[PDB]
Amino acid sequence: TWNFHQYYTNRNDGLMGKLVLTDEEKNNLKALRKIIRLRTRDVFEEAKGIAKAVKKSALTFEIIQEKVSTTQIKHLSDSEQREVAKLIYEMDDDARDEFLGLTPRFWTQGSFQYDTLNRPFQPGQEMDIDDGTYMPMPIKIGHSLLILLVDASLKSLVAENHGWKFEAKQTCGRIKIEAEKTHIDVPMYAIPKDEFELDSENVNLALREGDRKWINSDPKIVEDWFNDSCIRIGKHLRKVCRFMKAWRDAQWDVGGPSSISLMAATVNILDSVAHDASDLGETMKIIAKHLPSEFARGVESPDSTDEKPLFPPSYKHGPREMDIMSKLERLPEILSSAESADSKSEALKKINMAFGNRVTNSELIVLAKA
Ligand SMILES: Nc1nc2c(ncn2[C@@H]2O[C@H](COP(=O)(O)CP(=O)(O)OP(=O)(O)O)[C@@H](O)[C@H]2O)c(=O)[nH]1
Ligand SMILES: [Mg+2]
Ligand SMILES: [Mg+2]
């Protein structure tokens, strides 16, 4: 019988050592994020610079379009630029006044915010940094204008860098850097101006496509929920969540259960089942043992304003969810097979069936005390 605690927790050779980013990479992501923010604010200042000229005197739509064609907004399509000119020109004094006082704000969400960002494993997998852009508006400024300006910022940054690519997503604009295994998501929110924690009921997420242009979604709910869960459960929650995410990354090159569903399920389990934090191999064994049941009945979002769960119950499972249940069902067998191995190296080889050949030091495993 073996102990796998150091295998998990060692900050040099252990799984944690392989998953956590170095201060360098962390700073490279903060640098990329700062770049995106600076560009967004500059593009907004240029558009506001145009609109102030519109307010200061009647400017034909051609002139307004000539001014747009000289700003960073020139990195949009000709039709898109024309659209920006239209929306700026068709603004009534009121909306224009609310636009001239709009300075965008920024707040990061996701793994980079609550410290669960793993180093990617398989090719195609990249570091995900989600930096949300917030728009202090009353209650309103054009949804199309805002989306177009943030798109103009991102594309203006892509036009300055070899290897960068722009991708349009439903909830966000994205800048992809394949060569550096990195991508930055920029979701956009509308928030009450005067108020600007903050009343969730008014934090609206912008949608790119569909009949619905906005939907009430506050990321501070998930961030606070997970932080609270971390305080309540302990320091090991973040670790085992990192381990579960690494397992997901090792079993699927692309796809698998969402990180947030693994997080919610892991939290539920560590909230309802007794475990020992001084031994994360035992804890991981218990978690693996209880996860299939948690996913089978469905995983409800820690956000009650979500109509749909993070993972649906079994009677709705299709090929995808049945595949996820197959691997979730396969994990405990792997941890048990590794637990009862004949040698250190055999146990390593067996547990690396679950986390991949990332930990190579078999000396991190030890014989369990009596
Ligand atoms: N209320 C909800 N918010 C969500 C949901 N899915 C994602 N999000 C929000 O998007 C944020 C980031 O989403 P991601 O897909 O990148 C999950 P996360 O970054 O934590 O994991 P990794 O990026 O894979 O390391 C997350 O913190 C949430 O605030 C959801 O189903 N419900
Ligand atoms: Mg993220
Ligand atoms: Mg993302």
Side-chain angles (χ1 to χ4, degrees):
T1 166
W2 301 100
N3 189 271
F4 292 89
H5 187 69
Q6 287 159 53
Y7 166 91
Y8 284 112
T9 55
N10 192 272
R11 65 169 184 188
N12 294 297
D13 293 323
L15 198 51
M16 278 299 284
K18 300 306 182 170
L19 292 179
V20 174
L21 314 184
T22 49
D23 284 3
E24 282 89 69
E25 310 157 283
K26 260 173 215 155
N27 283 345
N28 215 50
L29 287 188
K30 305 165 142 175
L32 174 68
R33 166 181 69 172
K34 172 165 174 221
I35 291 180
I36 269 61
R37 296 176 170 187
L38 287 177
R39 191 45 71 87
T40 302
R41 283 194 290 263
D42 271 352
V43 172
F44 267 76
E45 284 303 300
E46 292 169 4
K48 281 155 54 163
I50 295 164
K52 187 168 191 49
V54 183
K55 166 174 187 191
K56 191 212 140 200
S57 23
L59 292 188
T60 66
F61 163 74
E62 284 57 39
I63 291 314
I64 298 185
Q65 184 180 15
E66 281 275 355
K67 285 167 161 327
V68 171
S69 73
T70 52
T71 51
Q72 315 252 33
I73 321 187
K74 69 170 167 176
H75 291 286
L76 288 190
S77 74
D78 280 304
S79 82
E80 268 166 342
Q81 303 185 24
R82 190 180 186 292
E83 230 175 300
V84 172
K86 195 195 78 158
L87 303 171
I88 291 192
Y89 171 80
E90 301 183 347
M91 253 187 273
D92 67 334
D93 302 45
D94 233 79
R96 179 169 306 126
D97 269 353
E98 213 51 272
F99 178 66
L100 291 178
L102 164 62
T103 325
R105 306 293 177 210
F106 306 90
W107 184 263
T108 305
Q109 73 206 51
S111 37
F112 200 76
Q113 189 53 42
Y114 33 74
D115 197 12
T116 47
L117 222 212
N118 287 332
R119 196 194 314 280
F121 182 38
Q122 308 202 51
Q125 295 178 352
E126 9 182 71
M127 297 162 184
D128 165 61
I129 173 164
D130 318 284
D131 200 34
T133 306
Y134 294 75
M135 311 291 177
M137 289 162 351
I139 297 139
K140 171 88 150 306
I141 307 299
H143 166 282
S144 301
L145 190 62
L146 299 176
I147 294 280
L148 278 173
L149 290 188
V150 175
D151 274 15
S153 172
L154 298 197
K155 278 177 184 165
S156 84
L157 278 173
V158 173
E160 284 178 19
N161 291 272
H162 287 94
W164 290 27
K165 190 209 162 177
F166 174 91
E167 287 180 11
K169 265 54 176 174
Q170 173 74 358
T171 53
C172 71
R174 167 180 288 183
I175 294 185
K176 190 188 184 84
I177 311 170
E178 195 149 41
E180 288 174 41
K181 314 195 131 196
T182 299
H183 74 255
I184 177 161
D185 290 332
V186 182
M188 199 242 286
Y189 301 81
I191 47 153
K193 194 178 206 209
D194 307 349
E195 169 148 28
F196 164 72
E197 236 114 70
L198 229 81
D199 294 355
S200 305
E201 275 256 357
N202 288 316
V203 184
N204 294 292
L205 172 61
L207 302 166
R208 191 168 295 270
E209 302 298 42
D211 283 15
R212 228 161 138 74
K213 285 179 169 208
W214 306 92
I215 64 116
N216 178 213
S217 198
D218 186 18
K220 253 72 166 276
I221 300 188
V222 174
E223 173 181 4
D224 282 347
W225 158 85
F226 186 66
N227 277 344
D228 278 354
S229 319
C230 282
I231 308 295
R232 166 171 79 262
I233 302 177
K235 292 165 168 168
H236 55 292
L237 174 64
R238 233 179 276 268
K239 295 193 184 198
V240 296
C241 275
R242 275 172 171 278
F243 300 155
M244 278 323 296
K245 274 166 67 170
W247 161 85
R248 192 267 331 275
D249 279 354
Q251 307 299 323
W252 289 278
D253 58 339
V254 60
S258 66
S259 300
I260 195 184
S261 69
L262 286 164
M263 281 164 87
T266 306
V267 170
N268 287 344
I269 299 173
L270 294 194
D271 259 345
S272 43
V273 181
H275 62 275
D276 189 11
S278 49
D279 187 9
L280 287 204
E282 195 203 22
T283 299
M284 277 303 282
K285 176 190 153 189
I286 294 160
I287 294 189
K289 179 195 303 159
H290 285 95
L291 276 169
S293 58
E294 278 282 329
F295 272 78
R297 69 194 200 201
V299 189
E300 96 168 327
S301 176
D303 188 341
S304 36
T305 69
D306 274 14
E307 291 177 358
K308 16 73 172 291
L310 304 181
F311 199 81
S314 55
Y315 68 85
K316 285 178 161 290
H317 287 175
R320 174 213 178 246
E321 293 82 8
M322 288 185 298
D323 175 39
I324 294 173
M325 294 287 316
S326 204
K327 304 220 189 328
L328 278 173
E329 256 156 21
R330 172 97 173 101
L331 182 52
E333 288 169 7
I334 295 181
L335 296 186
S336 322
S337 182
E339 197 182 346
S340 77
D342 289 317
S343 48
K344 301 201 124 316
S345 86
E346 192 203 329
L348 181 61
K349 197 240 38 184
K350 266 145 166 219
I351 195 157
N352 274 4
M353 282 190 58
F355 304 102
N357 192 30
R358 308 177 77 160
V359 181
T360 50
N361 193 352
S362 50
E363 279 316 293
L364 286 171
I365 314 172
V366 304
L367 271 171
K369 293 115 156 201

